[PDB]
Ligand binder design. Sequence first.
Ligand SMILES: CCCCCCCCCCCCCCCCCC(=O)OC[C@H](COP(=O)([O-])OCC[N+](C)(C)C)OC(=O)CCCCCCCCCCCCCCCCC
Ligand SMILES: CCCCCCCCCCCCCCCCC[C@@H](O)O[C@H](CO[C@H](O)CCCCCCCCCCCCCCC)COP(=O)(O)OCC[N+](C)(C)C
Ligand SMILES: CCCCCCCCCCCCCCCCCC(=O)OC[C@H](COP(=O)(O)OCCN)OC(=O)CCCCCCCCCCCCCCCCC
Lengths: 174, 71, 98, 347, 121, 105, 83, 171, 115
Amino acid sequence: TMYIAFILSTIFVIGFVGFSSKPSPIYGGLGLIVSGGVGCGIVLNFGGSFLGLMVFLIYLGGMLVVFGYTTAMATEMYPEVWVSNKTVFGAFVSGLMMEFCMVYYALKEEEVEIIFKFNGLGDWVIYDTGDSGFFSEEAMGIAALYSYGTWLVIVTGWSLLIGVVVIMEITRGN
Amino acid sequence: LFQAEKDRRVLQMLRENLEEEAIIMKDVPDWKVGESVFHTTRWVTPMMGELYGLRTNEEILSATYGFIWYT
Amino acid sequence: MPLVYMNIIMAFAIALAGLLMYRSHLMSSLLCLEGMMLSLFIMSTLIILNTHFTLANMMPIILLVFAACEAALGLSLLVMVSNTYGTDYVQNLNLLQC
Amino acid sequence: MNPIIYTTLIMTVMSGTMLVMISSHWLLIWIGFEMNLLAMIPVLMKNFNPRATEAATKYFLTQATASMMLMMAIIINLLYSGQWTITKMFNPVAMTMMTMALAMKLGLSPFHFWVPEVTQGISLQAGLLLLTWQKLAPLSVLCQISQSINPNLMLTMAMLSILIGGWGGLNQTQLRKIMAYSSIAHMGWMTAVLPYNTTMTILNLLIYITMTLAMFMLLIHSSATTTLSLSHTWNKMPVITSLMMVTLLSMGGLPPLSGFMPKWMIIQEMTKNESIIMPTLMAMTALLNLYFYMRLAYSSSLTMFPSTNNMKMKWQFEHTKQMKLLPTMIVLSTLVLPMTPALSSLN
Amino acid sequence: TMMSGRPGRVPLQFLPNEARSLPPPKLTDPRLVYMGFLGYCSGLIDNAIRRRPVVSAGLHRQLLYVTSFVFFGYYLLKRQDYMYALRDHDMFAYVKSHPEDFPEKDKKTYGEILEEFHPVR
Amino acid sequence: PFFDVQKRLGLDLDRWMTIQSAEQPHKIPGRCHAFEKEWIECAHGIGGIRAEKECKIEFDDFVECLLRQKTMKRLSAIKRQRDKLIKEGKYTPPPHHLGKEDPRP
Amino acid sequence: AGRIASFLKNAWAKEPVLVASFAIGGLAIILPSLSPYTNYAIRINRATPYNYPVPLRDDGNMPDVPSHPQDPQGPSLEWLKNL
Amino acid sequence: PGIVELPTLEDLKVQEVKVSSSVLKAAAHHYGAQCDKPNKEFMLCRWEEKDPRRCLEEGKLVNQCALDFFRQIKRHCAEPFTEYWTCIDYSGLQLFRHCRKQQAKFDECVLDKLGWVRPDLGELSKVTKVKTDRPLPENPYHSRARPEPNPEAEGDLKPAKHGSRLFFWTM
Amino acid sequence: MNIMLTLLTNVTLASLLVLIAFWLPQLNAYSEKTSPYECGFDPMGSARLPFSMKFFLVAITFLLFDLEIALLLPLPWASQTNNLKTMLTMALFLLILLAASLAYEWTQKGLEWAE
Ligand SMILES: CCCCCCCCCCCCCCCCCC(=O)OC[C@H](COP(=O)([O-])OCC[N+](C)(C)C)OC(=O)CCCCCCCCCCCCCCCCC
Ligand SMILES: CCCCCCCCCCCCCCCCC[C@@H](O)O[C@H](CO[C@H](O)CCCCCCCCCCCCCCC)COP(=O)(O)OCC[N+](C)(C)C
Ligand SMILES: CCCCCCCCCCCCCCCCCC(=O)OC[C@H](COP(=O)(O)OCCN)OC(=O)CCCCCCCCCCCCCCCCC
């Protein structure tokens, strides 16, 4: 078992609690980067190496722009950190306490939330016995974006081109 | 050849799990050993919990993560 | 359902509650918006990889693409607001009233 | 904005809505919503000023939140069924998330504040496109998934929409905010009938779109954005004020005008399903909308307000641009009550 | 959606092939005349908005308005009649197929039916 | 609302991706391909109402294959009973379950 | 034609990078439709046995299906062998 | 619902093929050429029955053919085969490209001692046909009777009686 | 497992180096030594004041193009498909749309830094 997926999921939730308590965009980006790396680990354990590395790389690139933007647009004299503010620390502690409570309840008994029913057992239990051979199912399914999914490529490329046009138009001014 | 070996190994582990379940759940009031959770009588591929359930953590880990962690 | 799905859904709920509760900066809310799509990506790929839905493996990539388009749109609006008002504070977006 | 870029952005908005309407896959529906929003932001920001920037920011924030909630609902539905097709949703929690997201997109209460704020922020053409097309898409999705809609949630949001629209419109004195609150009330009516007859939903959508197009184009023709600005139009072109007064009477639901047909059909259809309290409350609450339409009609056509001295030069000059299909919208929004049984063709 | 998804429905078809067996509307239909009247009203409103003589100017334009409205009204009436015929057909077939749900009841005369009398005084 | 242009024009834009029992690259089967096929075949052509009333057994099997809730309940019950029996020393695991056996190749 | 030559000579003197980029892209778009080896690439991809070749149940009316791998019937990769 | 049926441990017993992956990969083309028929019968059974419990005897026959093939090799070409699979076992990926001399010696030995011809490129991947006496499964999915379809439309269309019947409209 | 052990080893070695650096030498700290550096004179303002970014548009375009390359990365596996013509068409379509985005921004002066 080793509970590696559960530990990683808990760290994922912790990073979300951080950047959602919202200290300041520098530390929000730091927490989001931690969460992206940990999610890469979770999906690597579940099987998708390409998907994990891709989401990690995309969020590393995206948060690089956010740093430059918060240096220019979203900075103040004394940037707030988690312990610097009463509201930020309160929200951070609330999120951590909620995560701890739900984790403890799930481990102690099969916890049914007011939304969904969860069973405390093995993420290794839920896996499938069967195997593939001499190819990666994830890689083949992703590579099927060009043979299958011609429509998806068309709409995605159109959206990206129009996105360039839009960002040029919004920031025109005048 | 590996297909035949796989079928024999899976069925053997299932039979052993069934025997251990019969030994364990002998005093449970409403419990039928070997009862399927599916309405259909068609053969259903076991999940890793059904095969490596009553086994050591070493075997469980090898079966569930050995390939992914092998680098 | 495993506890992993519970944690991912909890992360999405936390990121949604973060977005809906502004403090001062628009950038922090944008970061909360980017976290929600990260949790959506992780949840979708966990569901797809477990079920061996081979042709659905491309869906998280499209999800990421449109997350990027949303982030670009939000950053463009943020630079326009900052040019107008000197700060990215959401208190300045009060000219229009209900 | 370059005319070519503007028309390609309009076409992209329309393409996103059409993708939403023709897709059978939840991912493609989400893609259509995203494409619509992305191309719709610059249209709002077409005339650059702080109000337009603020309106575009608020619209983007609301629509991004709604799209995120919609994708969460889609993924939750996939978890419990493994189905990507848009049909009855297999999870009540996913259905509740989907209903909340689509209501936030449409502006149903309590998700309505962005509607008056953004509409006042953006120009008349942008508000026309916003109301019409951006109501056109989510309602098609709701009609597709109607058989799993929670009647209690849908009807609660519909009655809230009707009440809020009436009251806000009562207070407002700006024409664009009046139009926005009227839009909220009409969306309330449509979604109230939604869990019983999607055909009646479509009929109300078409009549509302016609009346809104006529009203917005009359405002654009008269170049009036406030009550007092519209009070000068009787001294320039008294025909436009009369047409606007008849259109306002139609929008208020007075017989025998075309605005009575949707309310009539919806009341009848809900009564068939043994609903009486809800149709009676809905019918009585529309008197608020009629009151502020009549308040607007007093200022512009039924009374003659003071004018200014440069109106003489305005008399000397003539209106150049011609509105496309304005006479047709005026006629369709007032005189098609005897053509009611064509809703079977609409079926 | 009552009749959406009815078996044998071709998508995006304004008028199916099975609608050809119904009587087409007469060209002097009062509904067609009302559609022409709507076209004429649109033409007059066009002249009024553009500040031309309302009844005199743009006779060709007014003719085009009336003709377009009559054309579209003719096709709309055909589709409406087809949908109503389809509804009646389905209803009759269902009643025929479910006799236990739509039973014929024995008719009793008013000499046999007893009704309470409520005097007005 | 729904304009079935795909059905009208004979196109295939996303119906390939709608289900996991459809054509997959290299004929890779889904985890619940048989259950989904059975449910789809049962529910074909009878509409949503009758499909929900009558194919409930097939749908229940499909959801069981998807989520594995009854199986996890059984596994957890067996684990709890085994742990309780081991706590009081009433149960002894066999060597092939303790790791003192030679499995098949 | 003279205008085309003048434009190309000006671009080659001002933007050789862009001239090379467009030439390479244009060749990449056009050449595959003229190459006789595209079908060979498709055939080589089809000839790769990723999964098991499940045999057919013999009905006695399958003269083109081999009974053994080494029988003459069945696809041949002799074309790929000498390629 | 019901109780699953599992074969006992007595009838799951068989003589195992206790060679390693390198040994199997060395004698893989000759094995596929020689023991083709039992393996094809077993694979057809597995794909038609969709049930491990219904093709145990075919698995026993597969193991028996493998053991007979390896005994036949061991009786005649033990030394070249040992050299060949020793060469294969060194490679981390178990590549055929690095052991062409030993493969040549082994192929020469089995061609003379046993008359074996190694399959050419693209032959073991061919889809063949199998003659079996076991009947074709009628219901391999254990399906149920499908729900009866709704009755189709019948008759010719007549105009709606008394028109729309929508309130006061006479048409 | 091995990768986790490797990451742990690298992080532990770096942290030990930091610990040795901050604890081995003799330390003497006072307010003048630890003051911020600005070439011998005191800083007029604060280093936390807003710092204008003249390439704000190139950053957004970088986000979009980064996800374009994310789309392009699975091409090596896409070359093993039987639908080579469709794969090649869609790959060239994506690359041509990327080139079109670059050309549009370049001609509309999006690549020029603000003045
Ligand atoms: C190359 C990368 C890794 C580098 C690792 C370390 C490299 C250097 C190894 C040799 C270091 C020798 C000792 C230097 C200590 C600093 C000198 C100093 O501060 O002197 C002034 C001070 C003077 O003290 P004082 O008491 O006279 O002064 C009082 C203060 N004032 C100046 C104001 C009057 O020296 C000391 O305090 C002496 C402390 C003990 C010195 C020996 C202890 C360290 C032994 C190191 C052995 C190696 C293993 C452990 C080290 C880590 C490496 C694994
Ligand atoms: C030049 C002559 C004049 C032309 C003027 C043209 C103006 C109108 C443009 C034509 C509009 C209709 C398009 C006709 C071709 C499209 C065919 C298709 O769209 O028709 C059917 C659908 O068409 C429309 O739905 C109905 C057309 C009729 C609408 C106009 C009348 C609305 C009623 C208003 C009554 C009171 C006003 C009376 C008119 C003045 C297809 O059914 P289906 O694909 O499966 O729908 C799926 C979605 N559903 C099931 C939920 C509905
Ligand atoms: C299929 C598309 C239908 C809509 C097309 C609308 C195009 C015109 C839009 C502008 C507003 C109306 C026209 C007002 C006059 C404009 C200036 C002028 O002098 O126009 C002259 C023009 C002459 O007509 P002409 O262009 O030759 O006809 C088409 C030839 N191929 O004069 C005219 O064209 C006048 C008559 C216009 C047609 C009547 C109005 C629409 C009728 C619709 C019938 C269906 C009813 C429901 C409509 C719902 C909304 C579309």
